[PDB]
Design a protein around this ligand. Structure first.
Ligand SMILES: N=C(N)c1ccc(CNC(=O)[C@@H]2CCCN2C(=O)CCC2CCCC2)cc1
Ligand code: NA
Ligand code: NA
Lengths: 10, 249, 27
């Protein structure tokens, strides 16, 4: 349900 | 938050989201008290009865958010943890006494219109504002009912007299806790709920128009029940531990 | 130090829609 964050943050 | 309203943009710029990396989910509320320190509830990180014991590397700090689920490009900032500090006398065995913890950030966050630290009270501010009847403000992305909100929720709630707190529950209440909420006969209602944990109870001082974090969302019996109140960690009562931790690390 | 003062409200002298309810409770 959460938009995914920049991979860089994990 | 139940029976709250949507937050205004920038209304709670100290609001922090504790975010689990995998599976990516909301873990709790928290607050920004400096450019690298985040305040939260101990129980958000450590609660053995529920097999909860998070390590730094399990967590992310998301600051400046409004939307709960959205990645807020160019607005939110996301930070990694360098170190978790839990109150050495946090009472998870019994009543969540001293339900407080600090998180040091790997790098300082950049303040912005959406990101700004809250004050922590001094003795006089606490003595002046922590009075039955005085309202505080509680914010979070927790449940709306005992579903989930699209954006940060806000609710203002009256501090309640200690005997009414105590007589409302079978739990043993300590001087490290206060309770807030409307009484059944007061008409109005509202409460923190699951997910709101570790978030701030703040008050706006009429002496210098600054916002002070007087409590931390800690525990409750259901959410927004008649005759029940939300219980908050008393931040001023544990400020020595806070200062020491920050003064030492 | 500059704590507790919101860029979008106090620093601009704007009030949010319910902060007055807090003030009015302060006595
Ligand atoms: N109604 C409220 N004000 C409220 C606030 C926070 C919570 C969440 N906290 C919790 O879930 C804590 C930690 C584990 C047991 N516990 C309780 O509240 C159960 C009593 C639950 C309710
Ligand atoms: Na009791
Ligand atoms: Na209630």
């Amino acid at each position: 349900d959460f938009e995914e964050i920049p991979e860089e943050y994990l | 938050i139940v029976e709250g309203s949507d937050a205004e943009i920038g209304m709670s710029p100290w609001q922090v989201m504790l975010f689990r990396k995998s599976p990516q989910e909301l873990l709790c509320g928290a607050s920004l008290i400096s450019d690298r320190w985040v305040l939260t509830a101990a129980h958000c990180l450590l609660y053995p009865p529920w097999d909860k014991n998070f390590t730094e590397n399990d967590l992310l700090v998301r600051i400046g958010k409004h939307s709960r689920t959205r990645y807020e490009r160019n607005i939110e900032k996301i930070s990694m943890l360098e170190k978790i500090y839990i109150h050495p006398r946090y009472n998870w065995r019994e009543n969540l006494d001293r339900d407080i913890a600090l998180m040091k950030l790997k790098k300082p966050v950049a303040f912005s219109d959406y990101i700004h630290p809250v004050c922590l009270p001094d003795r006089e501010t606490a003595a002046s504002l922590l009075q039955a009847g005085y309202k505080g403000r509680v914010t979070g992305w927790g449940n709306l009912k005992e579903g989930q909100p699209s954006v940060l929720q806000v609710v203002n709630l009256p501090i309640v007299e200690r005997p009414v707190c105590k007589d409302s529950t079978r739990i043993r209440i300590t001087d490290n806790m206060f309770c807030a909420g409307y009484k059944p006969d007061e008409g109005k209602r509202g409460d923190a709920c699951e997910g709101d944990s570790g978030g701030p109870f703040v008050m706006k001082s009429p002496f210098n128009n600054r916002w002070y974090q007087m409590g931390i969302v800690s525990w409750g019996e259901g959410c927004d029940r008649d005759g029940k109140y939300g219980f908050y960690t008393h931040v001023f009562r544990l400020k020595k531990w806070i200062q020491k931790v920050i003064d030492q690390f | 130090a500059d704590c507790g003062l919101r860029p979008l409200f106090e620093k601009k002298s704007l009030e949010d829609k319910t902060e007055r309810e807090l003030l009015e409770s302060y006595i």
